Amino acid sequence: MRFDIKKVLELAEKDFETAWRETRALIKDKHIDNKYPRLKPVYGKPHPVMETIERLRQAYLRMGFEEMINPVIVDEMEIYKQFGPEAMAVLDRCFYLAGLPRPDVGLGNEKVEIIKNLGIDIDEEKKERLREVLHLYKKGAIDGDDLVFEIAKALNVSNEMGLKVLETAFPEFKDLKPESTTLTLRSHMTSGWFITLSSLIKKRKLPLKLFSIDRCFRREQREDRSHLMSYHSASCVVVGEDVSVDDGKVVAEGLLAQFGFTKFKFKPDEKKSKYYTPETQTEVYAYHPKLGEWIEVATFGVYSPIALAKYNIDVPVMNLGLGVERLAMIIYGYEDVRAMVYPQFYEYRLSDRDIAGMIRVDKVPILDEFYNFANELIDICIANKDKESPCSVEVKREFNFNGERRVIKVEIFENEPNKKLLGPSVLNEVYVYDGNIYGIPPTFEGVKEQYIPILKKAKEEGVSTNIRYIDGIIYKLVAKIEEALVSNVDEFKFRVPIVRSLSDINLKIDELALKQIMGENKVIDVRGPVFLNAKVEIK
Amino acid sequence: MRFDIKKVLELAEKDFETAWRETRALIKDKHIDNKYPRLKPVYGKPHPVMETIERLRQAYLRMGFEEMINPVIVDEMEIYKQFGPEAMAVLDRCFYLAGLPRPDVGLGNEKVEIIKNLGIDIDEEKKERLREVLHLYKKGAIDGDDLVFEIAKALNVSNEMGLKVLETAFPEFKDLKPESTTLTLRSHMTSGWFITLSSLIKKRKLPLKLFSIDRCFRREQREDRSHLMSYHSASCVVVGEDVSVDDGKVVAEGLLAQFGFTKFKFKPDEKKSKYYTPETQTEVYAYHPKLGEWIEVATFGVYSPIALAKYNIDVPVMNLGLGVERLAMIIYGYEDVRAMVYPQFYEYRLSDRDIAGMIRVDKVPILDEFYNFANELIDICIANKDKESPCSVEVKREFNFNGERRVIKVEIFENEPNKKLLGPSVLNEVYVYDGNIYGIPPTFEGVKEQYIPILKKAKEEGVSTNIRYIDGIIYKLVAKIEEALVSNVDEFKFRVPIVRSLSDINLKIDELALKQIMGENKVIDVRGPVFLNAKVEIK
Amino acid sequence: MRFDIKKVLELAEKDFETAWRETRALIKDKHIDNKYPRLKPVYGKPHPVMETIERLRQAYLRMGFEEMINPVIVDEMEIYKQFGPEAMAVLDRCFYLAGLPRPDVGLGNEKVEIIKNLGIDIDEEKKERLREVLHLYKKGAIDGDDLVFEIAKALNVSNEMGLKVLETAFPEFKDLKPESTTLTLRSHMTSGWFITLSSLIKKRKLPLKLFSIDRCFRREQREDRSHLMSYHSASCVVVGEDVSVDDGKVVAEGLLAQFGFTKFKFKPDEKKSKYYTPETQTEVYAYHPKLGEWIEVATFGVYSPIALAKYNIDVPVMNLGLGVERLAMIIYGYEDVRAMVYPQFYEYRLSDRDIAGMIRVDKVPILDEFYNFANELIDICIANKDKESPCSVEVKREFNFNGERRVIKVEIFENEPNKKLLGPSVLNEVYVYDGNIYGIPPTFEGVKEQYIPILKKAKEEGVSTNIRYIDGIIYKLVAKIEEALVSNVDEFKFRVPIVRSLSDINLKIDELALKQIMGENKVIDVRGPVFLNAKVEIK
Amino acid sequence: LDRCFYLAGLPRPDVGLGNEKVEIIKNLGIDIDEEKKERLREVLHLYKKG
């Protein structure tokens, strides 16, 4: 509710009497179901791999490298030019594209077979003998959707015609085998660089520096413990009339150096790929000041004149590759690659900070009036101690319901002795630590008072739910009062909980978390012989 | 050359005599070959598509969307669950992966055929009958490179063994056909979203907002005038217990709204994909205040409960897709998609600003001393006018060469009348406009003096090369003087150019640009009867 | 040098004989002065504070906050409205702007004083009695530069007039005191937020979320050990008809949570600023998993209705501030703030990786021919061992100099016994570790062979310079040969070094690093009794 | 400098500590409210001393 200017402003000017210290209201806490930790924040969360890409992509740009986009699909021949007599071995790890072919059932072999199948279906076929209408096959194939044959302005027909030409027919169509092609995916911007280079050297002026961080597919065939089938390669190439492996080392440094890496070094690669001038293919191991043993993040080399020759390139080229997902794991400290590339496909651990915001309140008054009464009734209960009952706390509010219904006397006390006016606690914060749910009053004992570093604010780990016992307890009470004014009840005082958990004192829990609490042997120590039946009549 | 502090500082303090106005030197112009436009700047250039991705990726994050990475390769069955009886039509545009299979030549059919091929080669085979050694095939296939069999510490062998098992053998290996699989690529994060969703709804707490801008492959089979085979889809999904098409419209707005788009609107899609609840698939046409007719940038819908059911999802999902390359063209105003995705694969037009930096100087003194003499000799020539010759400008410098060689008298004048002391110009800037090369003195004529808006600084388009006639001309002269002190020449005065172009006055041109100038009917109007033989002896 | 296509391509096709393995050349290592570590990479380096700003600025945007720019300079009165009776204490830390005032020397007091100073100078004053010309003072003050009075088309005058009206005059002008004003800088976007709010609440529709990370000036008067005079405040404000301190806690979380912070918590601020509703000003301490004890990164509160009233704001406001430089230090692990805000103003430590690239080669052949000879001559020296001399390695190359000058017999050997043909090393890499310069051959000894983890590639820390002894040594020799063909020398064999450092074997060092090596007690252990006088005649 | 702002802060009006030789027995309490405790002149000498 918005407040008035002068209404409050007057408390100032010249008539300033406890103005500031007052007016604290005008801004009430929006219920308890939205008071945080129950109230969480929202913000776009960038994926670790994609972010790492947007960082490298930026890493190069700051080195002056020109961003490119190499062809993703290359022809089997293009790899022969680069690798050569070796390609016949590398292709072992390359996927080949394929599509809807031709089973060669006719149009050539159809000389002694065609008078067999003349309608292998059992439904309706409007119109008559109008053989063929959509000759849109190999003549400008204009298709891709359904709604093949229909109807418009007429009657008794509807939008439907020929939506059944399979199932109980076409035996050799479900097992149809799309014939392969000479078009294959790739691996490393290299198989693309040449192409992107061949027809670029004579169009631009050297020296030339280029980079392209895109996808690639390294055929591994099912690998849940050794990368996947498609990774991101942060490659680049340096076209220079005078370049060597050194131009590669420097790049690898200037690149890693932008992530806080100071220790890496290089070591000759045994693979000695034949598309690389001999003795240049050097691996680039990296070890960032933290976990992740010296792991290979990159690998670069020089394009052998022979290979560059086949592409009509009259100048040496240096190429450095860097596995994005590789460096990715090092950055965010990830072990299982899969668990990173696809964050949500397994884990989902809920941190203590989350649990707190998942320990909601069971029942509460659904009437702003009563709700307010609760809070008010709660601050009241904060009084006295033991006395084996009774007291003098009965006379209470008398607000209306639907018509004159009021006079709701609520008496509060603790009949059972040694439990104060309400108990030796009723002020337990109910914190959350190491996945466990505790909650203890700011007092002291001696036995389990070792959980100091645990829970409790100040300099003691653990997140609070900002909910004391009495809170849920009273809300439970006031809730009932409400549930009664509609059920026609005159008296109260109830009981139901028994040694179990934090039930009672209200506070329920979302499925998740509760699925973890028990799924990981977490304890929920609260303990509360509340009861506080406390007689409350409505007359 | 670095200067001295006090040396210059003294000219101040209390003895301040034209100090500032002087000391202009100490900072000489680094030659003429590096004086700009010849001196161009370098900076990383981000690709239009990738940048657009880094913008959208950021567009979502600012809307609170969570970044993900959906599986790129899905099984043929996963599409059946989403599409269903329709998938048998959409698969028409989906590539299937494949690799090194088994021709079924033996290990099953090998019962009456094996005593035929026992060595189809004609070279060397070290050692003896040691049939098989690397049984690393179907038993933990540890391969991928060459260097198969080698040698280490010994003599007479070298690193080479068995690098020939084809060519003149294996007839059915080059035509080998990698058998297909049940693994196919995809199209739209959708075919991935379900998967990424199915096993995520019960791990997280709703509502749920996710996005992933990654690659996809829409089988089109050779399309140079209709997208390619792999595009980028900026998709997203909103998991909410209460969502509808509206949640899609809003996204499309909040998304496009971050690019300056205010006009878009939506229209129902006729395709009515069956993996979308009926009457939800609405296209999202966009028209940014500029070129590019109202073009479809997005398209969203709602996942039909049936489809979501097959994936064990108990809640509606809204999915909005946006073609990155699509919006890409609208942003950078591109027509041909290909010409954008792969910038350098055709065009490379050189803007006037480039030409200027490509109009270099033909010949120049290779001796700092002479070079300096040129510049000095150039400012000198700036004198007098006509006189049908002669004058009194002979006595000149006398610097050393390799030993006492000096006394180089250089006389300057214009023998032919009506050509001033050098000419009615010799101060032509040589500008570049509309791809043409002009250059005219700051004087006036009357005929072609219409090219005012063209060339010339101030408020008249066109880029200058900052090179006057005399410049190249004198450099040409001084150059010769130099070329002579080594050739043993005593006199000079030469001639060679004739009505052609800007030859003479030096200034040559790089292959490119010159390939355009003529390749696009550009004119090179300079015209210069220089000659200035000007006698110059060295004794 | 560019190579030919077919020239190399022919080695393939069908005539493939050691093609790949060959052609290794065509790409020579560009000298040794540019072979890395001597060859370092370059890339724009973002300042830690500014980057942190570009991260927070992005942190908010991802939370939906609207970016603003609050006024930097506010009037003394604006702070009174916010703070009130307290402002009279806070202003103690606020700078006040000031400019060229009026000493009140006349125009009011000029009644009995004006006939005193009528020209307190001793130079020239062109023209005559033309009292005043530029009445551009308080009447549209159009000034700001010099070139006050000048001259154009004429003779005997030059661009200069009245450039002297001080020094030997105006006694009370150098000590001139610019009078203060009611305009002061600020501290925290707060003093700006109100203003930015007051005239914004009725223009926009609530709720309202805003943020602005800009500068602020907290008067501390010289603080080299307690922040400076101007810091960056990453503040924000949430205008909501229903907001409380909680809306602040959540922000602080959603903000820090985007830096990897999971531990922070809040604690009530004792300061209890009166411009904040009582009991809301809560500090926000943060402890990132690393160094930097629990340090206060933020602090937020609620604007007291009274203060908001004075600005005509009819609704509570939540404000959270965050010291950028504060979080900055935590991120990049900085102790001294100054050492961060102004990176280069003290330190500049050169990491080992740098030293390597600063250990250049003393002297080298300045003739491509000789240079090449060196490298060739170097691989040659790699032969034999001890023999107390001599051998059979004299006959050598015979290339031309300036004319027939050739036949340069270079004999190589080690006269002194127990030093092999050259020495028991001459292959020392010369590494760099812990700021020290070592370098040892890949052999072994037993005494100091404890520096294994030190230097040496593989899995042993330390950066190499990729320079062996012989390298510098031979370059030194070949260098001489060259220096001789011009000095007219016939024989050689020299000596000059003695127990000192790595001198000899060439290799010098840049001033810096060498300033550190000794400035921090670093050792340079090489030790080399080279000598290798090796007789070399030129006839 | 004609276009440059100069910083400034709480100065000293030079009312005493130097000119206080014939003026100090004038203002000994220019207020009309409460002042707890008694004659305990000064307690927070936190001015020019840290």
Which of B17, B60, B62 is the best substitution to test chain C (most C C-beta atoms within 10 A)? B62
Distance CA A329, CA A333 (A): 5
Q: Give the phi and the psi of residue A252 in degrees, each rounded to 5.
A: -50, -35
What is the layout of strands, in order, in the sheet containing A436-437?
A436-437, A431-433, A463-464
Distance CA B46, CA A195 (A): 20
User: Quick one: angle between helices A368-381 and A469-485, nearest 10?
Assistant: 140
**Strand runs labelled E in B161-225:** 180-184, 208-216
C-beta of residue B330 within 8 angstroms of C-beta of residue B295: yes
| Alpha carbon of D3: minimum distance to chain C alpha carbons (Å) | 7
- Would you call D9 and C95 a contact, using CB atoms and an 8 Å cutoff? yes
DSSP-derived 3-state class of residue C471: helix
- Closest-CA residue of chain B to A222: B183
Distance CA B463, CA B354 (A): 9
Distance CA B86, CA B440 (A): 71
- The token duo for A74 is 């290359």
The response to whether C276 counts as a known ligand-binding position is yes
Judging contacts by C-beta atoms under 8 Å, the chain B residues touching residue A145 are 89, 271
C-beta of residue C82 within 8 angstroms of C-beta of residue C307: yes
After what residues is chain A interrupted, C–N > 2.5 A? Answer: none
The response to whether B188 counts as a known ligand-binding position is yes
Q: Please indicate if any CB of chain C lies within 8 Å of the CB of D7.
A: yes
Portion 160-219 of A in contact with B at CB < 8 A: 166, 177-178, 180, 196, 199-200, 203-205, 212, 214-215, 219
Place of tokens 């250990």: C359
Per-position b or e across B369-394, b if 16+ CB within 10 A of its CB: ebbebbbebbeebeeeeeeeeeeebe
C-beta of residue C284 within 8 angstroms of C-beta of residue C312: no
DSSP 8-state class, residue B459: S
Q: Which of A85, A95, A270 sits opposite B98 (nearest CB)?
A: A95
Q: Please indicate if any CB of chain C lies within 8 Å of the CB of D44.
A: no
The answer, yes or no, to whether B and C have at least 3 beta-carbon pairs within 8 Å is: yes
- The token duo for C191 is 């003093």
Q: Please indicate if any CB of chain B lies within 8 Å of the CB of A121.
A: no
Judging contacts by C-beta atoms under 8 Å, the chain A residues touching residue B345 are 196, 199-200
Distance CA B509, CA B361 (A): 8
- Contacts for B374 with CB less than 8 Å, ≥ 6 apart: B364, B365, B474, B475, B477, B478, B479
- Would you call B348 and A204 a contact, using CB atoms and an 8 Å cutoff? yes
Cis peptide before C390 (omega within 30 of 0): yes
- Contacts for C313 with CB less than 8 Å, ≥ 6 apart: C194, C197, C198, C201, C303
Distance CA C479, CA C397 (A): 15
DSSP-derived 3-state class of residue C42: coil
C-beta of residue C478 within 8 angstroms of C-beta of residue C328: no
Distance CA B242, CA B481 (A): 89
Q: Give the phi and the psi of residue A248 in degrees, each rounded to 5.
A: -85, -45
Distance CA C79, CA C310 (A): 11
Query: DSSP alpha helices (H): ranges in A283-345?
Result: 305-310, 324-331, 338-341
- Closest-CA residue of chain B to C64: B62
* H helix or E strand, kind and range, residue C191: helix C190-198
In Å, what is the CA distance from B128 to each residue of A288, A365, B115, B132?
Answer: 50, 93, 20, 11
Least Cα distance to C147 among C161, C132, C167 occurs for C161
C-beta of residue C479 within 8 angstroms of C-beta of residue C518: no
CA angle B138, B143, B149 (to 5 degrees): 110
User: What residue ranges of chain C are covered by domains with CATH 3.30.930.10?
Assistant: 42-348
Least Cα distance to B98 among B177, B31, B16 occurs for B177
Judging contacts by C-beta atoms under 8 Å, the chain A residues touching residue C23 are 277, 304-306
Q: Give the phi and the psi of residue C102 in degrees, each rounded to 5.
A: -135, 115
Distance CA A511, CA B202 (A): 9
* H helix or E strand, kind and range, residue A231: strand A231-239
Chains that touch C (3 or more CB pairs under 8 A): A, B, D
C-beta of residue C229 within 8 angstroms of C-beta of residue C218: yes
Task: State the count of interchain CB pairs (< 8 A) between B and C.
Answer: 8
- The token duo for C461 is 């820390």
Distance CA A267, CA A283 (A): 5
DSSP-derived 3-state class of residue B432: strand
Q: Please indicate if any CB of chain C lies within 8 Å of the CB of A3.
A: yes
DSSP string, B294-322: SEEEEEEEEB-HHHHHHTT--S-EEEEEE
Greatest pairwise CA separation for chain D in angstroms: 54
The response to whether C288 counts as a known ligand-binding position is no
Q: What's the length of chain D? A: 50
Judging contacts by C-beta atoms under 8 Å, the chain C residues touching residue D8 are 95-98, 180
Neighbours of B184 (CB within 10 A): 24
- CB under 8 Å, gap of 24 or more: what pairs does A134-142 form? none
**Strand runs labelled E in A403-532:** 431-433, 436-437, 463-464
* H helix or E strand, kind and range, residue C470: helix C469-485
DSSP-derived 3-state class of residue A302: strand
- Would you call B230 and A72 a contact, using CB atoms and an 8 Å cutoff? yes
Q: Please indicate if any CB of chain C lies within 8 Å of the CB of A39.
A: yes
* H helix or E strand, kind and range, residue A317: strand A317-322
Q: How far apart are the first and last CA of chain A?
A: 33
- The token duo for A329 is 């794991």
Choosing among 3.30.930.10, 3.90.660.10, 3.40.50.1980, 3.30.830.10, the CATH entry for A42-99+179-348 is 3.30.930.10
Q: Which residues are registered as beta bridge partners of A96? A: A184
- Contacts for A144 with CB less than 8 Å, ≥ 6 apart: B89, B90, B92, B93
Query: DSSP alpha helices (H): ranges in B85-189?
Result: 87-90
The response to whether C465 counts as a known ligand-binding position is no
* H helix or E strand, kind and range, residue A98: strand A96-98
C-beta of residue A258 within 8 angstroms of C-beta of residue A249: no
- Would you call D9 and C143 a contact, using CB atoms and an 8 Å cutoff? no
User: What residue ranges of chain A are covered by domains with CATH 3.30.930.10?
Assistant: 42-99+179-348
C-beta of residue A502 within 8 angstroms of C-beta of residue A524: yes
| Alpha carbon of B63: minimum distance to chain C alpha carbons (Å) | 7
Using what technique was this structure determined?
X-ray
Q: Which of C27, C41, C242 sits opposite A63 (nearest CB)?
A: C41
Q: Which of D2, D6, D10 sits opposite C98 (nearest CB)?
A: D6
Q: Which amino acid, one-letter code, is at B335?
A: E
Which of C4, C15, C20, C24 is the best substitution to test chain A (most A C-beta atoms within 10 A)? C20
Neighbours of B454 (CB within 10 A): 17
- Would you call A88 and B166 a contact, using CB atoms and an 8 Å cutoff? yes
Distance CA B178, CA A183 (A): 12
DSSP 8-state class, residue A397: -
| Alpha carbon of C312: minimum distance to chain A alpha carbons (Å) | 7
- The token duo for C252 is 């602080």
C-beta of residue B162 within 8 angstroms of C-beta of residue B176: no
Choosing among 3.30.930.10, 3.40.50.460, 3.40.50.12240, 3.40.50.12780, the CATH entry for B42-348 is 3.30.930.10
- Contacts for C107 with CB less than 8 Å, ≥ 6 apart: none
- Contacts for B244 with CB less than 8 Å, ≥ 6 apart: B280, B302, B316, B318
Burial class (CB in 10 A: 0-12, 13-18, 19+), A65: buried
C-beta of residue A476 within 8 angstroms of C-beta of residue A506: yes
Q: Please indicate if any CB of chain B lies within 8 Å of the CB of A343.
A: yes
Judging contacts by C-beta atoms under 8 Å, the chain D residues touching residue C98 are 5-8
**Strand runs labelled E in C41-86:** 66-67, 74-75
C-beta of residue A461 within 8 angstroms of C-beta of residue A350: no
Judging contacts by C-beta atoms under 8 Å, the chain C residues touching residue B63 are 64
Q: Which amino acid, one-letter code, is at C64?
A: G
C-beta of residue B301 within 8 angstroms of C-beta of residue B316: no
HSE-up of residue B139 (Cα within 13 Å, Cβ side): 3
Q: Please indicate if any CB of chain A lies within 8 Å of the CB of C8.
A: yes
| Alpha carbon of B60: minimum distance to chain C alpha carbons (Å) | 9
- Would you call C246 and A63 a contact, using CB atoms and an 8 Å cutoff? no
Distance CA C467, CA A189 (A): 33
- Would you call D3 and C185 a contact, using CB atoms and an 8 Å cutoff? no
Using only C-alpha atoms, chain B has a radius of gyration, in whole angstroms, of 38
Q: Please indicate if any CB of chain C lies within 8 Å of the CB of D47.
A: no
Burial class (CB in 10 A: 0-12, 13-18, 19+), A300: buried
CA torsion sign for A91, A92, A94, A96 is positive
Least Cα distance to A172 among A103, A83, A88, A258 occurs for A103
Distance CA A525, CA A436 (A): 8
| Alpha carbon of B483: minimum distance to chain A alpha carbons (Å) | 29
Judging contacts by C-beta atoms under 8 Å, the chain C residues touching residue B64 are 62-64
Q: Which of B88, B212, B271 sits opposite A145 (nearest CB)?
A: B271
C-beta of residue A261 within 8 angstroms of C-beta of residue C45: no
DSSP string, A517-532: HTTTT--B--------
Resolution for this PDB entry, in angstroms: 3.6
Chains that touch A (3 or more CB pairs under 8 A): B, C
Q: Please indicate if any CB of chain B lies within 8 Å of the CB of C62.
A: yes
Q: What's the length of chain C? A: 539
- The token duo for C235 is 């503040």
Least Cα distance to C438 among C464, C459, C419, C458 occurs for C464
The response to whether C189 counts as a known ligand-binding position is yes
DSSP string, C363-424: ---SSHHHHHHHHHHHHHH------SS--S--------SSSS-----B-----STTS-SS-S
Distance CA A44, CA A37 (A): 19
HSE-up of residue C221 (Cα within 13 Å, Cβ side): 11
Distance CA C439, CA C468 (A): 8
| Alpha carbon of C242: minimum distance to chain A alpha carbons (Å) | 6
User: Which residues of A are part of a known binding site?
Assistant: 188-190, 233-235, 275-276, 319
Distance CA A383, CA A375 (A): 15
- Contacts for C448 with CB less than 8 Å, ≥ 6 apart: none
Distance CA A432, CA A464 (A): 6
- Would you call A61 and B47 a contact, using CB atoms and an 8 Å cutoff? no
DSSP 8-state class, residue B91: G
C-beta of residue A509 within 8 angstroms of C-beta of residue A488: no
